[PDB]
Write a protein that binds this ligand. Structure first.
Ligand SMILES: Cc1cc2nc3c(=O)[nH]c(=O)nc-3n(C[C@H](O)[C@H](O)[C@H](O)COP(=O)(O)OP(=O)(O)OC[C@H]3O[C@@H](n4cnc5c(N)ncnc54)[C@H](O)[C@@H]3O)c2cc1C
Ligand SMILES: Cc1cc2nc3c(=O)[nH]c(=O)nc-3n(C[C@H](O)[C@H](O)[C@H](O)COP(=O)(O)OP(=O)(O)OC[C@H]3O[C@@H](n4cnc5c(N)ncnc54)[C@H](O)[C@@H]3O)c2cc1C
Ligand SMILES: Cc1cc2nc3c(=O)[nH]c(=O)nc-3n(C[C@H](O)[C@H](O)[C@H](O)COP(=O)(O)OP(=O)(O)OC[C@H]3O[C@@H](n4cnc5c(N)ncnc54)[C@H](O)[C@@H]3O)c2cc1C
Lengths: 540, 540, 540
C-alpha cells in the first residue's frame, strides 16, 4: 500500500511533490531581486519561509525575540557530547513529508521513537487504579484493552468513514477525499471529542470503566483525556493522517533542523552569490524581537524592534504564536480585516510539562529473574507522571529518561516522579542510576509563548478557515495586503510540526505572488489550486 | 408564587426547613459532649459545620492555613470606612436559602446586585466586534438579542422540560422533580454545554453569529462561553434553581458572614456555658495549616499541623478544595476507598481574575446632555475586560467599579482595562474619578487554592455522586469511617456558595451520626432521607 | 535629671515645644486658604504634614501608591480581635517626643517593649558559639558581658564625649551642644562604625572574642554587626539621643497612628468648617500612586497619577523613600539642582525580615522546676533567628512571638526558626502552643519600597546636609522652589520614626513660608532659627 501522508484532508495539496520537483518553487521578476521581506520568528515556519524566499532571490530579514528554533529545542546534558533532552517537539510522524524534506536535505539521522508496544520499545507497563499490567506485546494485555481498541476503531469507521478516508489519502484521490471530508466538517465542527465518544454506539456498549481507560491510557499506547474538550475535527485530522503513530526522533536533537536551515547553502539560488546562506545574508544572527508592525505613509510596512529601530518592507510574515499579534506586538488595526482580528483573538493554548534525567546506562534492559520482566518499561499511568519514555543510546553510553510527560522547582518535579515510579516499580532503583542535571520545561513560562500549541475549539472551524486562507490576497483591499501569517496555530494540525511547515509554504507562495512572481507551469504551487481544492467555507 | 430555591434537583432536601425547625438539628448523647472534631478550613463550609457541631455539644477545632473566610473575602480600600471590594463570591442568588439563613441570623443587610438589565442597573452597554449598543431595557437592544434569548429558552424548554422542573421546584414535589431530573442525568452527563447548544433545534436553525453572541454576552445579561466545556448537567442545575439571577450583595462585604459565624453566640447550645462562640472555644483563632491526616494506632485520626504538632480526633472534616487531599495534604491511603481516591484525583478548576477601583462619586449616573446616554453603564464586551460593574453607595459616598471580571502587576491590569473602556466610552474620563488603591485578585496565584471553583467535567457524574454521598458511612469499612468532606467542589453547584453550605450540613449530619447522635423525630435531616431521594447511581 | 530627647545634635530644634505652644504653628494669608498642596505618600511623614497644613487652612491632597501608613503597618492575626503583629516599626523610644505628640493627641495607649534585660522582660537567653547563658538580670551574665559594656561606654566617652553631649541634650544647651557635635562631624563622617571600634583603646585591650560578642549580641541587649559598615556619625546620633533604649509599643498596633491622624478632627482649623478631617477633605481616601511630577507652563507643579490624571499645585511634598524620585517617579530634571540630584541618587537601603506567630497563652512565663529557668526567654543568638521577642497580652489571652528579627515561603521561615529555637531550648515545645496564621514581612519585595530604611554611608554627610536643608528655599532659583522632600531618608536618624516626623515638620514650615505665611512671634518654627543653629556645611 502507498503510505499515509499529511495530505489534506482540508487542503490536499502535495507539498512534498512541490518541494521535490526539479523546476523549483517558481520565480520572482529580477527587478525585485534583493528586496527585503521581514519574517517575525526564527522557529521552523519562519526559517523554512526565509530559506525558500532567499532561493527566489529576495532578502529575508528574520527577527527573533528569544531563542533560534522556537518550539524545536534540544538541550545537551552538562558534561556530555550530544546527549540531549528534547524540550519542544520530539516525535515526528513519518507521514510529515514536507518536514522530512528538510530533515533529509540536511542529511540528519532519525530513528524510531520508543513508543509503547512498538518494535522500538521492549516492554510497556500500564498502571491504573493501583493495578499494574506488564506487556511485551499488545496480546499480553488483558482483554479489556483490545475491547477498547475495537470500540475506537469501530467508532471512527462508523462515525467518520475512517477506512475510506485513509484509502483516498493513500491514493491521493482528491475528489473523493474532499467528498468524504466535507461531509464531516459541518457535522463535527461544533462537537467535542467528548461528544463523539458519548454518542458512539461502540463506546456505549462498553462499561464506564472502559471509557475511563480509553481517556487515561487509550488501548495501551497513550490516553486521550487531554484532547477530549477539543473539536472532534482536529482529532479526525490527527488520526486520519497517522500523526499519532510511526514516529521518529532526530538523532542529536531536532533543533539541528532550524539551526541547519539557518546555515545551509542551497545549490541553486536566484540572485545571490554562490555560498550564500540565511546566516551569510544576516551577518550571522537574526534581528532582535519585534514590538510594532504598522503601515508606513509610503504604503510599505513598518517594523519596529524592541530597541526602537524601525525598518520598511514590501511584505511581512509573522510566525509567532498568532495571539501575540493582538497583545505584545502592537500591530496596526488597518492591517487585518475585522473578521481576521476576530479569528486572531480567539485562539486558545494547551499547556504541557516534561522533565528529563540522564542515566549511566540503559539499565531498564536488565531482567528481573524472579518475574521475567524488564527492570523498567515505557510506563503509562493515571498517576502524576502519565507517561515515561526510555531512550537507549546504546549499551555503553548514557540513556535518557523522559520521567514525566503531562498536559515547583525542577528538583521537586523529579522527586515527585521518582516517588510515583517507586509505587509502580517498587523493586527497581532508578535514582541510583541518574547522573548529570535534570532538565525540565513548561512552555507557559516565557512569553513569547502562550502554551505548547493551540487546542482546536469546538465551533471554531470558521476562524481556522479564514486564517488558513489569509495568504490568498487577490481579493483583499490594498491596505490589508502584504502582511502574511504562518505557523502551527494557522495550520489544521496545531500540535504537529508538519502544520507549521505547510502553512509556511503557503505563505511562501503568497509572498512570491505579492512580488509579482509565479510558479512554473509544470510545478504549480498552493495558491494555483487553492480556490478549487482549498478548505470549504461554511455559511453565515 | 412559591419561590424557586436551590432544592435539588439531585438531592431535593429542604436544608432551609431543617435549619429553621424549632426542634434544632438533633442531639448527641451527653457522654460524648466536649469531644473534639477536627475541621480543616475556615471558609463557609468549615465554619457552618463547626458552628452546628458546637451547638450539639462537640468541641470543633478549626485549622486554617491562610485567611479566615476562604473565598468569601472582602478588602477595604485605603483609608476608607466600610468601602469594600469583593475578591471571592460577590453576588448571591436569593434561591440560596441555606446561605441566607446565616446572613439573616447575623442580621446583615443585603442589596440587589447591579446586574445588566435589572432594576438595580440603569443602563447596559454591549460592545461586540467593534460595535456598541446602549440599552436601558431589554427591548432597546437590536432583534438579534431577543432571538438568542428565545432560542435559549426554547432549547431548555424542549431539551430539558425546564418549565415543569421549575414548577416541581417551586412546589417542592420530590417524586415529580426526581422523575423529570433522573431522565436527564444519563442523557447529558457526558455531553458539554457546547454540544447541548449546538445540537439544539432552536440554535441550529439560527446563524453562526447567534451562537457566537450567546458565548460572548448571552442575550444581553452575560456570556456563557466560560461554561461551554462543562458537563451540561452542571448548567441545568444552575439555571433550574435560579443561581444566575435575582442576586444580592452583602452590604459591608460577604466576609462578614464567616467572620460573624466565628464570633456568634448561638440561640441554643448543648454542653457549653452560656455566651460560648467558636471564637471563645478556640481562645480566639483557628489552629494553623494541616500537613498530614493519618489513622493512629488507638483507631483515632491523627492531624499534624504545619509546625509538626500532632493531635488525635474521633472525626475529621476536610473543607479545602478537595484536590489538595491528593497533594498538599499528606492524607493516608487507607482513609479513602480506591474509588473515592479516583474521584478526588479527578477534579479540575476554573480560573478567575477581577480588578476593582474606587471612584470619588457615582459619576456614571450623569447624563450626557447630547446622546441622552449615561456616562457609563454595566458593560459587557468581547474585549479583555468582559464585564464591568458599577456599585452605587449613595450620591454622597465613594463608588466602586469592578473594571474587569474575566474567566501582570495590578497597575498594568487596571491600565489595560481603562484603555479598553476608552475604546468603548471614548468621551468619558473614568481615570479622573479614580481614588484610593487598585485591588486585584487571581485565585490561582495562592497555594491553598487551585482556582476560583471547579468546572464539572463531562462524564464525571459517577465521581460527583460518590463524593456527594461520602458522608453516608453505614456501609463503609471501619478504616474509612470518621473522615468527612464538604465544600463547593463536593456539591452539585460548584461555583455557588449554597453548595458549600449544603454539603457542610450533610457532613454535620454524618458527624452527629458518627458520634451516636440522631435527629429529632419531628425534624429529619439529610442522612435520614438520603437513601430514598438522594442522587441516582449510574450503572457500570 | 531632665529626660534625654531627640534634640539635635545636628539641628537642636524643640519640635515638641513648637507643636505644644498654645499659639499654633503659624498662619497663611487668608487669600490663599483652600488652595491645594500635593503630598506624595500617606506614611507618617505625609500625614503629619497634611494634618498640620490642613490646620493652616490649605487643602492637602494626599497620594498613596500602596497601603495607608507606609512602614507603620500592623496586621491582625486571623480570627482575633486586635491581636496584631507589627510589620514595620515596632519599638518607639520615648525620646521620640514629636512622634509621641501625635500618639498622645490620638489618646492611644503604649506599653514598655519586652527588650532584653529590662523590667518588661522576665529573662534573657544568649546563645553564642553553641553555649547558652541564661539571665534574669545583667549581673547573672558571665564577666565577659560587663567587660564589653565597659569597653563600649569607655569608647564613646573617650571618642565622642558622650557624657557631655548627653548633658547638653538634657539641658537643651544649644551653644554647647553644637560645639561638641560640630567637632565630631568632620572627624567621623568618613569613618565606619567598624573603624571606630578598631581604633578605640578600650576595644583594643579586649580579646578578639569580645569584639565578636559585641557585634553578635552587644553587652547582652542587642548586637551591632548590621550597623558596623555605616557612618559612625549615624551611630553617635542613635546612642546620644537614646533611640536604642526605653522603647514602647503601641497597644493595638502603631498603624493606628497614621490611620488616626487621617480621621482626626482638630479642635481649631483655619478656614475649614468645624468637623473637617483629612478624611472629610478627601471624600474618604487618598488619591492613587504618582507617576510624574513636572513644571507646568503656568509655573505651577504638575502631578500625574498612575492612571494619567494630571492636576496642578502651587507646592508638592514628596515623602516616598527618596530614591524613587530618580527612577519610578518621572520627576522633571529642572525641579532639583544638580547637587540635589546627586544627593538623591546616592541613598542606599538596608534590608530586614521579621516573622511572627501567635500562641495560645504566654507559656514562656512557666518555670522548669529541674532548673529554675523560664521555659523560654527573650533570645539573642548568633544563629539564623538573631533575636526573638515575646509579647505577653495577659495570662488569659493569646501571646505573640516575633520568632525572628534579622538584617523561602513563610512556612519554611517559621520551620527554620523553630528548628534553631529547638537547639537553644531542647526541652520546650513551642510548636505545640502556636495557633492562627504566621505573618512574615520582607520590606525589599513591594516597591514602592527599597528596604526597611537607609543605611548612612561613610562620607555622605554632605549629601545628607543638602537634603536636610532642602526645605529652606529663599536662596533657590524660582524653578527649584515649591517642591519639598521629607521622611526618614531625609532625616538624621534614618532607622527611627522621629526622623520622619521632624523632617515632615520642617517641610510644613517650608510650605507655609512658600504660601507667604509665617510663624507667630512667640512660637518660632524650624526655618526661623535654621540659619543660626542648623547643621554645619562642610567645605568643598
Ligand atoms: C511540548 C511540545 C511537544 C510537541 N510535540 C510534537 C511532536 O511530538 N511532534 C510534532 O510534530 N510536533 C510537536 N510539537 C510542535 C512543533 O514543535 C511546533 O508545531 C513547531 O515547532 C512550531 O513551529 P513555528 O515556527 O509555528 O513556531 P515557533 O517554533 O513558536 O516559532 C515562533 C518563534 O517566534 C518567536 N517570537 C515570538 N514573539 C516574537 C516577537 N515579538 N518578535 C520576534 N520573534 C518572536 C518565538 O520566540 C519563536 O522562536 C510539539 C510542541 C510542543 C511545545
Ligand atoms: C472568583 C469567585 C467568584 C465567586 N462568585 C460567587 C457568586 O457570585 N455567588 C456565589 O454564590 N458564590 C460565588 N463563589 C463561590 C463561593 O465563594 C465559594 O463556593 C465558597 O466560598 C466556598 O467555600 P468553602 O468553604 O467551600 O471553601 P473555601 O472558602 O476555599 O474554604 C476552604 C478553606 O480551606 C483552607 N485551607 C486550604 N488548605 C488547607 C490546609 N492544608 N489546612 C488548613 N486549611 C486549609 C483555605 O485557606 C480556605 O480558607 C465565587 C468564588 C470565587 C473564587
Ligand atoms: C522593619 C522596620 C523596623 C523599624 N523599626 C522601627 C523602630 O523600632 N522604631 C522606630 O522609631 N522606627 C522604626 N522604623 C521606622 C519607621 O517605620 C519609619 O521611619 C517611618 O515609618 C517612615 O515613615 P515615612 O512617612 O518617612 O515613610 P513611609 O512610611 O515609607 O511612607 C512613604 C509612603 O509613600 C508611598 N509611596 C511610595 N511611592 C509612591 C508613589 N509613586 N506615589 C504615591 N505614594 C508612594 C509608600 O507606599 C509609603 O506608604 C522601622 C522601619 C522598618 C521598615
Amino acid at each position: 500500500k502507498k503510505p499515509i501522508t499529511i495530505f489534506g484532508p482540508d487542503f490536499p495539496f502535495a507539498f512534498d511533490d512541490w518541494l521535490e520537483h526539479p523546476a523549483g518553487l517558481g520565480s520572482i521578476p529580477a527587478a525585485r531581486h534583493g528586496e527585503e521581506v521581514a519574517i517575525v520568528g526564527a522557529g521552523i515556519a519562519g526559517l523554512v519561509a526565509a530559506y525558500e524566499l532567499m532561493k527566489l532571490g529576495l532578502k529575508p530579514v528574520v527577527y527573533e525575540a528569544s531563542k533560534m528554533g522556537g518550539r524545536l529545542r534540544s538541550q545537551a546534558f552538562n558534561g556530555t557530547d550530544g546527549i540531549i533532552a528534547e524540550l519542544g517537539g520530539m516525535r515526528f510522524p513519518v507521514s510529515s513529508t514536507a518536514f522530512y524534506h528538510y530533515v533529509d536535505k540536511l542529511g540528519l539521522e532519525t530513528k524510531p521513537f520508543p513508543n509503547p508496544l512498538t518494535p522500538a520499545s521492549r516492554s510497556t507497563v500500564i498502571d491504573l487504579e493501583g493495578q499494574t499490567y506488564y506487556a511485551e506485546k499488545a496480546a499480553d494485555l488483558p482483554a479489556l484493552f483490545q475491547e477498547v481498541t475495537d470500540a475506537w476503531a469501530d467508532a471512527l469507521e462508523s462515525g467518520a468513514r475512517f477506512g475510506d478516508i485513509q484509502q483516498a489519502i493513500r491514493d491521493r484521490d482528491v475528489p473523493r477525499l474532499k467528498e468524504l471530508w466535507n461531509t464531516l466538517v459541518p457535522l463535527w465542527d461544533d462537537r467535542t471529542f467528548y461528544d463523539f465518544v458519548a454518542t458512539s454506539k461502540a463506546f456505549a456498549k462498553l462499561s464506564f470503566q472502559h471509557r475511563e481507560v480509553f481517556g487515561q491510557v487509550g488501548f495501551g499506547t497513550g490516553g486521550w483525556d487531554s484532547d477530549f474538550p477539543n473539536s472532534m475535527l482536529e482529532i479526525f485530522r490527527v488520526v486520519m493522517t497517522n500523526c499519532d503513530d510511526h514516529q521518529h526522533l532526530v538523532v542529536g536533537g531536532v533543533e539541528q533542523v532550524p539551526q541547519g536551515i539557518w546555515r545551509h547553502v542551497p545549490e541553486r539560488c536566484a540572485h545571490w552569490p554562490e555560498g550564500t546562506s540565511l546566516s551569510s545574508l544576516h551577518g550571522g544572527a537574526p534581528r532582535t524581537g519585534v514590538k510594532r508592525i504598522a503601515r508606513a505613509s509610503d504604503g510599505r510596512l513598518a517594523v519596529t524592534d524592541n530597541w526602537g529601530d524601525c525598518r520598511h518592507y514590501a511584505a511581512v510574515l509573522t510566525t509567532c504564536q498568532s495571539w501575540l499579534l493582538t497583545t505584545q506586538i502592537d500591530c496596526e488595526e488597518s492591517l487585518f480585516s475585522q473578521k481576521m482580528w476576530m479569528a486572531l483573538d480567539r485562539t486558545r493554548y494547551m499547556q504541557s510539562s516534561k522533565t528529563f534525567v540522564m542515566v549511566d546506562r540503559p539499565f531498564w534492559k536488565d531482567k528481573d529473574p524472579e518475574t521475567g520482566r524488564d527492570l523498567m518499561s515505557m510506563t503509562l499511568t493515571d498517576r502524576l507522571t502519565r507517561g515515561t519514555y526510555l531512550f537507549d543510546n546504546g549499551d555503553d553510553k548514557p540513556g535518557v529518561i523522559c520521567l514525566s510527560y503531562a498536559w515547583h522547582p525542577v528538583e521537586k518535579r523529579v522527586q515527585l516522579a521518582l516517588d510515583a515510579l517507586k509505587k509502580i516499580y517498587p523493586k527497581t532503583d532508578i535514582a541510583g542510576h541518574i547522573i548529570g542535571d535534570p532538565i525540565t520545561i513548561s512552555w507557559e513560562a516565557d512569553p513569547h509563548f502562550l502554551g505548547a500549541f493551540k487546542g482546536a475549539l469546538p465551533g471554531h472551524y470558521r476562524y481556522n478557515q479564514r486564517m488558513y486562507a489569509h495568504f490568498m490576497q487577490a481579493q483583499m483591499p490594498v491596505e490589508q495586503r502584504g502582511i502574511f501569517i504562518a505557523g502551527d496555530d494557522v495550520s489544521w494540525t496545531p500540535a504537529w510540526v508538519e502544520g507549521a511547515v505547510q502553512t509556511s509554504l503557503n505563505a511562501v507562495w503568497g509572498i512570491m505572488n505579492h512580488f509579482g512572481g509565479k510558479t512554473h507551469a509544470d510545478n504549480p504551487g498552493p495558491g494555483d489550486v487553492f480556490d478549487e481544492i482549498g478548505q470549504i467555507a461554511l455559511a453565515d
